[PDB]
Symmetry: D2
Subunit: 321 residues, 4 copies
């Protein structure tokens, strides 16, 4: 039968007999994502351009406000880390719950003007310390995630939710404002045919990345070369990696020596989705999910996707170390 | 002062003292684009998955454009990426314009929710002969109007005509295309290059060297960034709004490239030239190619003029 | 073949060879009505209740209609139930039409969610002098177009002009008005009567007797049914669609009626007459009343012609 | 703090420490209501009129039938119901054993039939009981008096879409925001006015009125104490008329006459849910002889008379009615 996000989570949440708090958190997040989607699709833009006479908020800020407010009022969270905010937000005591959430409310906003995909990325942790809530509660390794995923505001809006039972994909039906389950227990292809990275950094690449990409374009075994795709929005590039397989790279380069993407709310959520889908995600040195963060906005290199492709890259990496 | 597409084009048409047929055409096209956008955003998908107890999206998109244009009384010949032969409008509905379109561009990848789009070019029928595919075999220089709809994070219609390029954002709350950027011009030189570098082994030597200069600039300037969505509408629109260069050039598998002249290259080349950019095959302007087959391919390199001219310098060096 | 409000008006306008101003006006009204419908259905209400951490609807609806009509370049004088004096369009946006409208008919009503609507009447400015409130003082016989949008279970625009009455359903998936009922004609005689019987104490004897004939018919037919929503657009639209009669008569506690002649009675009378119905004050056709004040009231009895004639027979008895 | 139907119900239930089955039921009901609302507002009607050339024709079902299919399918798949009674089908629907939950639902999927083509308000009425018999579930489990209701209410598809939900604590109203498909709490713990100024019934039937009804309506048009006469409103859709009665006060009547000596409306999925909403809002609902909620049904489709609304107005009707006994 048909299933919706709310019903799917409600029913899985009744089964494993948890405190109900994660279900409440996810439902509040879903509401925020639907509201972001509506704003990203520009519903009501006519009023901004004077339809009612001579006359609000950048999408970035509004998306952050929507996630912040819905998570606060879920009574399920205590610490919230957002790409938008310099410091972690500590939820007021009367609305504090069990969970810590790191999120990027509108990934890809530097591509909004060209209208390409934007998205929301989130990662959810159980607060581990009994201390008063603080930034330190978000400094957990991605291995500690209890749920993670993203919403892609693409040609359609889809929510990908990873939990320790696997990855499930929901399509927003805007006629009824309902996320419909359309792909259950998804697994990434063992090996793909697409590679995805910004090759404009070629001058600054490590020898390992340089060699690996040369193998994709000029296969030593004379097989067909991989195709290339790079949207430049991480949700779009990672989602395509999930559904068609292949490999996504945002390595450190000489000008971003610790990486470009942010560990807490870009790399770790996507690494968790990948691993729950049977894929891999590495910094080169170690699994993304094993990095122990020290700073909430710290960066990380990331190479992720189909296991055979990531293993091949790691083989090239070991040769150059 | 707020402007919808409907109001804008009609007011422009009055000042041009036309009959109104082209305005009627564009209105019918916009209605089709709104319907494509709604289906692309998956309105009603809950019913397909059983909420109450499977045509392809680009077939439906083709049917929408075909039906809306036929019933506009403004068209006589319709060439679609979707259809083997040109469609001849029934005599009682024939108007004076010929439309070439790709109803859902980039749609072999809707599975990843990548941007998709609709591309269109509109010609005046040039002879009084009985309508046929020959009426669609005009060089892009002959275009009366061209553009695209981009179904991305939001839905946008870019409309190019003799006057220039104007961009309209679809407000889905009221189904109006609102004018948001007027008389758009591309920047003289950009900092993004866009092509499928997985073809690298088969590149023409000039393409190899040009792309090498983007990554390793001989003057030690900043390397260009790379973007390649693999959807023509998305890649061209980014080129328009940010500047830079987009390439689908000729080589081995493809002495004529791979994109199609009538409903991919020509509409995009026309938008580009009206916005102050360029679009070349490497040997000529795209808009100067006289087609002989409605599905014929053309190489295309387009975008900011300084970038396209720099590509042509490397191209001549290898010629 | 499918048709839309925009395409229907535009093809009808190009045919008639008028100045195009009426087409521009109706398109601007279309846009305003879709924006009102969106707001009436409470799109975005979550933001009012703090989802991210200010006008009432009647005011917003007035602003939408006023702004969109002004920017149509088709109007010169605008009369709204919301504004004490007529609005004079500034010289650089002036066209030749006068519009009287009720931007959101239904007031003691929004809070209980029953149907509301927008009513409009479009008169042509005869004179050649500077426009003023006096130009809106014209009989309904000078209407060139009139109708209403009903925001009910669905949103419908009913448009009457000299060719007759046509009904368009708003498809909110694509934000387009779809032609669904062409050349509408009201039933010759209906079976429903519609008025507020709470005024029975103050009813004129002719109204009292007519209503008794509906409840106890002199020929032993079945009694009429009664329906009274209390929103004029809803009651009149039901009258048009199912037949019957609608009454807001002069009671002794207000001898000129309650409803306003210019932007409630006249537009509805015009729709009715163009659909083969009738609309009377009791003494004369609503459309023949010559107003002396833009907000003057008039009694109205309208609907199926045999039903209005039967009321008039009773009315002439009490003389 | 903003509140949605889902979150509001979720946390009221945790306070009551229920199983969560009722919350699950209500969530699935809300999904059906959103789908009904989208169809009633005519989303996609352009495809019915040939926008894509008439190759694309659900969609073609009448709204009545679609609405029943939507409610039936979402309640079945909720895993919260065992017996479902709809106006549409002669017999009660018994949920497949695999999907069986503990609740019984009686509903009117799209109240207002002679009424869609003129675009008047339509709506969805529902009443929710707990199964009590230990037997295999059967039609008999729906034959409970309105007093046993766990929850009831309606969706009104009017100028906007509103869900009114009554439970033993009281009545709450949620506005559907169609931009995001969320029911927003806009009016909490709603109470009806003690006495109103509007009366609601089909006066075209006057020839067939009970003399008690005739007298009462005469009293509202020509008050004996020389007070202002009441205003009259009759939409002809029960959900619209009852919602107006709830919001503005007054009285709504569908009493016994000639075409129907037992009234016209159906007890299980029209009269009882509105009677439960009214009583939870401080109002009344009588057949004339007894409370609607105290009628013990023997037939899932039996009719009942109903007079409901502001308590002072209903009491006054009852005094006239007793005087004609
Ligand atoms: O990998 C997968 C798939 N794991 C399952 C996903 C998951 C697990 C645990 C939770 S949980 O921690 O939040 N636990 C509750 O939800 N427990 C509860 C127990 C009893 C009733 C209710 C309830 C009541 C009313 C409405 C909704 C639910 C909730 C949430 C999600
Ligand atoms: C920037 C630019 O190139 N603008 C011109 C775009 C354009 C649009 C449409 C046409 S058209 O051939 O379709 N003609 C019209 O739209 N004509 C028109 C519109 C509105 C009103 C009237 C009119 C004129 C005179 C009397 C009554 C009505 C005509 C051409 C160019
Ligand atoms: C059934 C009925 O009553 N039909 C008459 C409807 C009608 C609509 C509009 C007009 S008009 O006075 O506004 N005149 C025009 O619209 N004239 C016109 C001439 C040429 C071109 C155009 C046009 C319209 C739309 C887009 C482009 C060009 C309009 C009169 C009667
Ligand atoms: C006004 C009024 O009467 N409110 C009560 C409404 C109500 C709604 C739903 C139910 S229920 O039977 O379905 N039970 C729940 O919803 N229970 C519930 C919700 C959320 C979380 C938890 C929970 C409790 C303990 C541990 C984990 C999770 C339970 C009852 C009354």
């Amino acid at each position: 039968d048909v299933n919706t996000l709310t019903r799917f989570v409600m029913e899985e949440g009744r089964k494993a007999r948890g405190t109900g708090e994660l279900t409440q958190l996810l439902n509040s997040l879903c509401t925020a994502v639907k509201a972001i989607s509506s704003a990203v699709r520009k519903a009501g833009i006519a009023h901004l351009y004077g339809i009612a006479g001579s006359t609000v908020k950048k999408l970035d800020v509004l998306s952050n406000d929507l996630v912040m407010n819905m998570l606060k009022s879920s009574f399920a969270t205590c610490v919230l880390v957002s790409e938008e905010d310099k410091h972690a937000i500590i939820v007021e005591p009367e609305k504090r719950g069990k969970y810590v959430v790191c999120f990027d409310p509108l990934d890809g906003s530097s591509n909004i003007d060209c209208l390409v995909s934007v998205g929301t990325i989130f990662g959810i942790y159980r607060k581990k310390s009994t201390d008063e809530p603080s930034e330190k509660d978000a400094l957990q390794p991605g291995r500690n995630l209890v749920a993670a995923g993203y919403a892609l505001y693409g040609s359609a809006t889809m929510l990908v939710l990873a939990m320790d039972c696997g990855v499930n994909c929901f399509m927003l039906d805007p006629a009824i404002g309902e996320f419909i389950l359309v792909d259950k227990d998804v697994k990434i292809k063992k090996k793909g045919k697409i590679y995805s990275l910004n090759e404009g950094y070629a001058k600054d690449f490590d020898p390992a990345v340089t060699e690996y990409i040369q193998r994709k374009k000029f296969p030593p075994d004379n097989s067909a070369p991989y195709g290339a795709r790079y949207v430049g929005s991480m949700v779009a590039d990672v989602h395509r990696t999930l559904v068609y397989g292949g490999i996504f790279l945002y390595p450190a380069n000489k000008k971003s020596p610790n990486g470009k993407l942010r560990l807490l709310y870009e790399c770790n959520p996507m690494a968790y989705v990948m691993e729950k889908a049977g894929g891999m995600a590495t910094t080169g040195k170690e699994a993304v999910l094993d990095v122990i963060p020290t700073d909430i906005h710290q960066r990380a290199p990331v190479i992720l996707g189909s296991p055979d492709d990531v293993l091949e890259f790691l083989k090239v990496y070991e040769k150059h170390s």
